[PDB]
Paper text:
Gap junction intercellular channels (GJIChs) facilitate direct communication between adjacent cells and play important roles in various biological processes such as cardiac contraction, electrical coupling, cell differentiation, and death. GJIChs are formed when two opposing hemichannels (also called connexons) from adjacent cells are docked, each being composed of six connexin (Cx) protomers. Cx43, also known as GJA1, is the most ubiquitously expressed connexin protein. We identify three different N-terminal helix conformations of Cx43—gate-covering (GCN), pore-lining (PLN), and flexible intermediate (FIN)—that are randomly distributed in purified GJICh particles.
Because the hydrophobic pore region formed by TM1 and TM2 helices (referred to as the transmembrane pore region) was almost completely covered by POPE and CHS molecules in the Cx43 GJICh structure under condition 7, the empty space inside should have been filled with hydrophobic or amphipathic molecules, although their map densities would not have been clearly seen in the structure. To address this hypothesis and exclude artificial densities generated by D6 symmetry imposed during the 3D reconstruction process, we determined the structure with the same dataset without symmetry imposition (C1 symmetry) at a resolution of 2.7 Å. In the structure processed with C1 symmetry, we found that many density blobs formed a thin layer at the extracellular end (referred to as the extracellular layer) of the transmembrane pore region in each hemichannel part. To determine whether these were noise densities, we compared the densities inside the channel with those of the lipids in the nanodisc and outside the channel. When we gradually decreased the map contour level, we found that the inner densities appeared slightly earlier than the outer densities and that their sizes grew at almost the same rate. Because the inner densities were located immediately next to the heads of the lipids bound to the channel interior and were as strong as the densities of the lipid heads outside, they were likely POPE heads. Therefore, the channel was likely occluded by POPE molecules at the extracellular end of the transmembrane pore region. By contrast, although we observed another layer of density blobs at the intracellular end (referred to as the intracellular layer) of the transmembrane pore region, the density blobs were weaker and shorter than those in the extracellular layer at the same map contour level. This suggests that phospholipids in the intracellular layer may not be highly ordered probably due to six NTHs, and thus the cytoplasmic end of the central pore formed by six N-termini may not be completely closed by lipids.
Numbering used by the authors:
A (entry chain B), B (entry chain A), C (entry chain F), D (entry chain E), E (entry chain C), F (entry chain D): 2 to 111, 148 to 238
C-alpha cells in the first residue's frame, strides 16, 4: 500500500490543470514516443547507404549528402521532445522537494509560489515547440523531393543525386507536424484557462 | 494486497461489455501484437536491399521502389493498431479520474455519463478499422506480384523490377485482413448488444 | 502474500488434468520456445543472402528463391505454436471471469459447464497440430537437398541453385517433428484419460 | 515476507544432496551460461561470411561449408545444456505439486517416493553429458585446422578452403570440454555419495 | 512501506546542498545520458565505413583514419561522464556504511567528518570536467572539416580524405560543450555557497 | 520490510574486511563492467572486416589475422573478470548455507571456519589477476602497431597487413592495465590488514 504518497504528488502537481488536458496530453505524449520509436526510426536507417549520385568523382557523395541533410529528422525530433519534456520534470522535482519540506514543517511543529512556476513551464514548452517548428520550416520545409541538385566541391559543375523513401518520410513528417500543432494548441488552451480563472479572483 | 483497486477499475471499465467479448478481443489483441512483432517484422527487413531492376541507369531503382511502395505494410499496420487502441486508453484514463473524484466526494461528505463515451469509443474504433481497410484496398489491394513495371524518370521507357518474398508477404497480408475483419465484427456485435439491451429500458 | 488467489486459479484450471501431463507438457512448451528462440532462429538468418544461382540473368535468383521457399520454416513454426497455445489462454481468461462472478455471487448472498470447454480446447490443439504437420509434409517434406532446379521465368530453360546450411536445418526439422509428435501424443492421452474417467460415472 | 515457501521448496529439493555440490554445480551452471552468452557466441558470428575457397565454380563454397560444418558448435552446446538442465526442472515441478498435495492432505485432515526420481534425474544428466561428448568427439574432435580439403560436387577435383578464427575456437572448445568433464565428475560424486549413504541403512 | 530509509539516506546525503542545485544538476545528468544514448550514438555508427580517401594504395585509409581520429568523441564523452559520476557513488557508499555504523551504535547503547569528503568530491568533479575539456580542445578543437589532408606512410606524398556527417557532429559537439560548461558552473556555485555559509560560523 | 536478512548476510560476509576496501573495490568492479560493456566492446567490432593485407593470394588474410590475434582482448578480459569474480560468489553461497544451518540449530534447540575460506578466496583472486597479466604481457605486450608482417603459408614470402583503430585500442589497454593493478593492490592491502590484525591475537 505504498502508493498513497504517489497519488498525493499527482494531485498536487495537477492542481491548476483542466480535466481533459491531463488525459489528452498524456496520451499524445505516449503516442508521440511510440510512433517515434517503432516505425519512424526504422525508415531512416538506410538514409546514407542507399544515397547515390551520378558521378565517378570520389568524395562527391559525402559532401552532397552532408549539404542535403545537415541534420536528420529523427534526431531533430528527439531533441524537440526532450526540450519540450524537461520543464515538467523540473516542476515535478521542485514539487517533490517542497512537499518534503512542508511535511517536515507540519510534523515537527505539531497563491503564487507554485502557480508562477507552472505558468513559466507551460510558456517555455510552447516557446520551444514554436521555435523548433520555425527552424524546421526554414531549413527543410515539409516535403522531400526524389532528385537533388548538388553544386559543392569537389563535384564538377552540378550533379544529380537520389534519395531513399521520400514519400514515406513526407507522410511521417506531416504526421509529426500535426502532432506538434495539437500539442501547442492544448498548451495554449491551458494557459487561457488558467488566466481566465485567475481574472475572476 | 495492493490489487483490489485495480480489480475495481477493471470491473467499472467493463460494466457494459459482454462476457465473451472481453476474452475474445483481448486475446485477439495479444495475437495481433505477437504476430506483428515476431514474424511479420523480420520478413520485410530486406525490402529495399534485395529490390533489383534491369537497367544501368543510376537512380532508377530508388524512384521505382518509391513508386511501388509509397509506404511499407508493417508501418501501416502499426499506425492502424495504434489508432484502434488509443480510444480505450483515453476511456481508461477518464474512468480513473472519475473514480478518484467520486472517492473524494463520497469520503469527504461521509445512466449516460459514461455510456455515451464508451459507445463513441467503440464507434471510432470501428470507423478507423474500416477506413484503414479501405485505404489499403485502394492503394495496394490484397496481393503482390513478383514483377513490377516502372515508367518513371529518369528510367528510359519502361523497366522491369523484381520484389522480395512476395508469396510470404501475401500470406501475412491475408492473415492480417482476417484479423481485422474479426475485430470489426466483434465491435459491431458489442454495439448491437448495448443498443438492444438499452431499447428494453 | 498476494499469491493464494493465483494458486486457487491454477488448481481450478487443472481440475481434470492428470498428474504427469502438467509437468511433461509445460516443460515441453518451455523446451520448444527456448529451442526456437536461441539456436533455430539464428541458423536461418542468411537464408536469402547466401542463396546463389548459376546464371547472369537478373531477377532469376529472386523468383527461384521464392519458388523454393514460399514460407520460411521458422515463421511456420511460430504460427503453429501460437495457434496451439491460444486455446489455453482463452480457457484461462474464461475461468478467471467465472471465478470472479462466483465470488460475487457467494459474497453478496452470504458438471459440464467447464469440462466441455476444456475438452474442446484440447481437441482444437490436437487438430491444429495435425493440420500443421500435414501441411508441412505436403509442401516441403522433412528434408532439404543442397541443389535445387529452377524452371521459372525469366530464367532461361532450367538453372541450378544452391542452398545454405541444409544438413543443420534438416536436423532441426527432425527435432521439431519429434517435439510435435510428443505433444500430440500427450494431448491424445489426456483426452482418453478424461473420457475413460467419465464413462464410469 | 512471501519467501518462506520458496525456502521450504529449496530445502525439500536438496534433501539428499551434499553440502558442496550445491554451490559448486550452481556456480558452474552460471559460469557456463555466461561464457556461452557473452564471448563464445560473438566469435562464431562470421563463420560463413568469412569462409572462403580458391575456385571460380559457383556453389562450391556453400557445399564445402556444409560438409565441413554440419552443425555449429554453439548450437550443439545450447542443445547439450538444455538437455542437461531439463530433468532438474521436471523434478522441481514434481516436488512443487507433491508439496501442494501434501499441504492439502495435512490441512483438511487436521523413503523411495522422491529418492528414485532424483537418482534417475542425475543418471540421465550424466548419460546426456557423456553422449554429447562422444558425439562431438566422433564428428569434429577437439581441434580445428586452418585449411580444409573439399571433394564434393560440383567442385572439380579437390579444392582448398580457409576457416575463420581457428585458434580462438579451439581454445573455447577446450574450455567447454573441461567444464563438461567437471560437471560429469560432480554428478558421479553425488551418485556415489547417495548410494554409499543408503548402503548403511 | 519499505522506503523511509531511502528517504533518510537521501536527506543525509544532501545535507549541505542548495535547494535548486539538486533539481538542476539531476535533470542535467538525465538530459546528458538521454542525449548521449538516443541520438548521439547513432550518428557515429558509420564513422569508418563511410570514410573514404582518393588513392589506390592499400592501407592508406586505415592509417589516415587512425591519424585523424585517435579516439572517438562518443567514447571520450562516456569516459568523461563516468569519471564525473564516480565520486558521488563513492560518497553515497560511504554515507550508507556510516549510517549503518551509527544505527548499530545508537541501538546497542540505548562538523568535518562528512563535509570534507563532500567538498573533495565536488572539487574532483570540477577538476575532471576541466581536464577533459582542455584535452578535447587541445586534440580536436570544437569543429570538424569535411576534407582532411593525410601525410602518413604508406600513403605517397599527401592525399585527401572525406569525413561523414561533419555538420551534425559539430552541432552535437557544441551541445555537449554547453552542457559541460553548465555543469561546471553549477558545481562552482555549490562550492562557493558552502564556503560562504561556513565562513559565518 | 523483507530486507533485514539481506543486511545480515551483507554484514556477515564483510566481517573481516576493511572500511574503505568495500567501497573502493565495489565501485572499481562497477567501473570495470561499465567500461567493458559500453565503449570497449564497440571499438573491436570491425576487427576482422577492416583488416586488410597487400596481396592477391586467397586465404592469406585469414591466416595472417589468426596469427596476429590468437584471441581478442575483449574476450580475454571477460574471462579474466569472470575468473576474478567467481570466488566471491562461492563464498557468498557458502555463507548463505552456513547461516541457514545455524538458524536451524539455534531455532530447534531453543575463529577459523570462515576466515580461512575468505583468505583463500582473496589469494586466488590475486593469483588469477597476476597470471592473466603475465599471459597478456607474454603474448601481446601493452601496445599495438599499425603495420604487421606476416610470414605464414600460403602467403608467399612476407606480406604487410594493416590493423584497425590501433591507438584507441592501446589507450583502452592502458586503462584496463591500470584498473587491474589497482585491484591487485587493494587485494594485497586486505591480505596484509587481516594478517596484521591476526598477529596481535
Ligand atoms: C524523453 C524520452 C526520449 C524519447 C526518445 O527519443 O527515444 C527514442 C525512442 O526510444 C524508445 O522509446 C523506443 C521504444 C521501443 C518500444 C518497443 C516495444 C513497445 C511495444 C508496446 C508493448 C505493449 C504491451 C529514441 O529512438 P531509439 O531509442 O529507438 O533509437 C536507438 C536505436 N537503437
Ligand atoms: C500499441 C503498441 C504498438 C505495437 C507495435 O507496433 O510494436 C511493434 C512490435 O513491437 C513488439 O511488441 C515486439 C515484441 C517482441 C516480443 C518477443 C518476445 C516475446 C516472447 C513471448 C514470451 C513468452 C514467455 C513494433 O515493431 P518492432 O518494435 O518489433 O520493430 C522495431 C525493431 N527493432
Ligand atoms: C507464444 C509465444 C511465441 C514464441 C515465439 O515465436 O517467439 C520466438 C522466440 O522468441 C523468444 O522467446 C526469444 C527468447 C530469447 C531468450 C534468450 C535468453 C534466455 C536464456 C535463459 C536464462 C537462464 C537464466 C520468436 O523468435 P525471435 O523473437 O527470437 O525473433 C526475433 C529476432 N529479433
Ligand atoms: C535472496 C536473498 C536471500 C535471503 C533469504 O533467506 O531468502 C530465502 C529464499 O532463498 C532464496 O533466495 C531463493 C531464491 C532463488 C532465486 C534467486 C536466484 C536468481 C538467479 C539464479 C540463477 C540460477 C542458478 C528465504 O530464507 P528464510 O531466511 O526466509 O528461511 C525461511 C525457511 N522457512
Ligand atoms: C537453459 C538456458 C539456455 C541458455 C542459452 O542457450 O542461451 C544462450 C545465451 O543466452 C544468454 O543467456 C545471453 C546472456 C546475456 C547476458 C549479458 C549481460 C550479463 C552481464 C552480467 C550482469 C552483471 C550485473 C543463447 O545464446 P544467445 O541468446 O546469446 O544468442 C542469441 C543472439 N541474439
Ligand atoms: C518515488 C515516489 C516518491 C514518493 C516518496 O516520497 O518516496 C520517498 C523516497 O524518495 C525516492 O523516491 C527516492 C527513489 C530514488 C530512485 C528513483 C529514481 C530512479 C531514476 C533516477 C535516475 C538518476 C537521477 C519517501 O519519502 P517519504 O514520504 O516516505 O518520507 C520518509 C522520510 N522519513
Ligand atoms: C554512468 C553511466 C554511463 C552512461 C553511458 O555511457 O551509456 C551510454 C548510453 O547508454 C544508455 O543509457 C542508452 C539509453 C537507451 C534508452 C532508450 C529508451 C529510453 C526512452 C525513454 C522512456 C520513456 C518512458 C553508452 O552508449 P550505448 O549503451 O547506447 O552504446 C551501446 C550500443 N549497443
Ligand atoms: C561477471 C559478469 C561478466 C561481465 C561481462 O563480460 O559482460 C560484458 C558486458 O556486458 C554488459 O554488462 C553490458 C552492459 C550494458 C549496459 C548499458 C546501459 C547502462 C547505462 C547505465 C544506466 C544508468 C541509469 C560482455 O560484453 P557484451 O554483453 O556487451 O557483448 C555482447 C554484445 N551483444
Ligand atoms: C529515465 C527516466 C527518469 C525518464 C522517464 C521518466 C520521466 C521523464 C517521465 C515520467 C512521467 C512523464 C510525463 C508524463 C506526461 C507528460 C505529458 C505532458 O505534460 C503536460 O504538460 C500535460 C499535463 C500532464 O500530464 O500533467 C508532457 C510530457 C509529460 C510531462 C511526461 C514527460 C516525461 C515524464 C516526466
Ligand atoms: C507504454 C504503455 C503505457 C503502453 C501499453 C499499456 C496500455 C496502452 C495497454 C494496457 C492494456 C491494453 C488493452 C488491453 C486489451 C484491449 C482489447 C481491446 O479493447 C476492447 O475494446 C476489448 C474489450 C476489453 O478488453 O476491455 C482493444 C485493445 C485493448 C484496449 C488494449 C490496448 C492497449 C492497453 C490499453
Ligand atoms: C505477453 C504475454 C501475455 C504472453 C505470455 C503469457 C501466456 C500466453 C502464457 C503464460 C502461461 C503459458 C502456458 C504454460 C504452459 C502451457 C502448456 C500447455 O498447456 C497444456 O495443455 C498442458 C497442461 C497445462 O500445463 O496446464 C500448452 C502451452 C501452455 C498453455 C502455455 C501457453 C502460454 C501461456 C498461457
Ligand atoms: C524461462 C525460465 C522458466 C527458464 C529459467 C528458469 C529455470 C529453468 C532455472 C531456475 C533455476 C535453474 C537451476 C539452478 C541450478 C542448477 C544447477 C544444476 O543442478 C544440479 O544438479 C546441481 C544441484 C542443485 O543446484 O540443486 C543443473 C542446472 C540447474 C538445475 C539450473 C537449471 C535451470 C533452472 C531450473
Ligand atoms: C548499475 C548501477 C549501479 C549504475 C547506475 C546507479 C548509480 C550509479 C546512479 C543512481 C543515482 C545517480 C546519480 C543521480 C544524480 C546525480 C547528479 C549529480 O550529482 C550532483 O552532484 C548533483 C547533486 C545531487 O543530485 O545530489 C551527478 C550525477 C549523479 C551523482 C548521478 C550519478 C549516477 C547515480 C549515482
Ligand atoms: C546472473 C547473476 C547471478 C550474476 C550477477 C550477480 C552476482 C554474480 C554479483 C552480485 C554482487 C556482485 C559482487 C559485488 C562486488 C564485488 C567487488 C569485489 O569483491 C571484493 O572482494 C571486494 C569486497 C566486497 O565488495 O565485498 C569483486 C567483485 C564482487 C565480488 C562482485 C561479483 C559479482 C556479484 C557477486
Ligand atoms: C523429447 C524426448 C521424448 C519425451 C517423451 C516422454 C514421454 C514420457 C511420458 C511419461 C508418462 C506420462 C504420463
Ligand atoms: C544427412 C544426415 C542427417 C542426420 C540427421 C540426424 C538428426 C537426429 C535428430 C535427433 C532428434 C532427437 C529427438 C529429440
Amino acid at each position: 500500500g505504498d502508493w498513497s504518497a504517489l497519488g498525493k504528488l499527482l494531485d498536487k502537481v495537477q492542481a491548476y490543470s483542466t480535466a481533459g488536458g491531463k488525459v489528452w496530453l498524456s496520451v499524445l505524449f505516449i503516442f508521440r514516443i511510440l510512433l517515434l520509436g517503432t516505425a519512424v526510426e526504422s525508415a531512416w536507417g538506410d538514409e546514407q547507404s542507399a544515397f547515390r549520385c551520378n558521378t565517378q568523382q570520389p568524395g562527391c557523395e559525402n559532401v552532397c549528402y552532408d549539404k542535403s541533410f545537415p541534420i536528420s529528422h529523427v534526431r531533430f525530433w528527439v531533441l524537440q521532445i526532450i526540450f519540450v519534456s524537461v520543464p515538467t520534470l523540473l516542476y515535478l522535482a521542485h514539487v517533490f522537494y517542497v512537499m518534503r519540506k512542508e511535511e517536515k514543517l507540519n510534523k515537527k511543529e505539531e497563491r503564487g509560489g507554485l502557480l508562477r512556476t507552472y505558468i513559466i513551464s507551460i510558456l517555455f514548452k510552447s516557446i520551444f515547440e514554436v521555435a523548433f517548428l520555425l527552424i524546421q520550416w526554414y531549413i527543410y520545409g515539409f516535403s522531400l523531393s526524389a532528385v537533388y541538385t548538388c553544386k559543392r566541391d569537389p563535384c564538377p559543375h552540378q550533379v544529380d543525386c537520389f534519395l531513399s523513401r521520400p514519400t514515406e518520410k513526407t507522410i511521417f513528417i506531416i504526421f509529426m507536424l500535426v502532432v506538434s500543432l495539437v500539442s501547442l494548441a492544448l498548451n495554449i488552451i491551458e494557459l487561457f484557462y488558467v488566466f481566465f480563472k485567475g481574472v475572476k479572483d
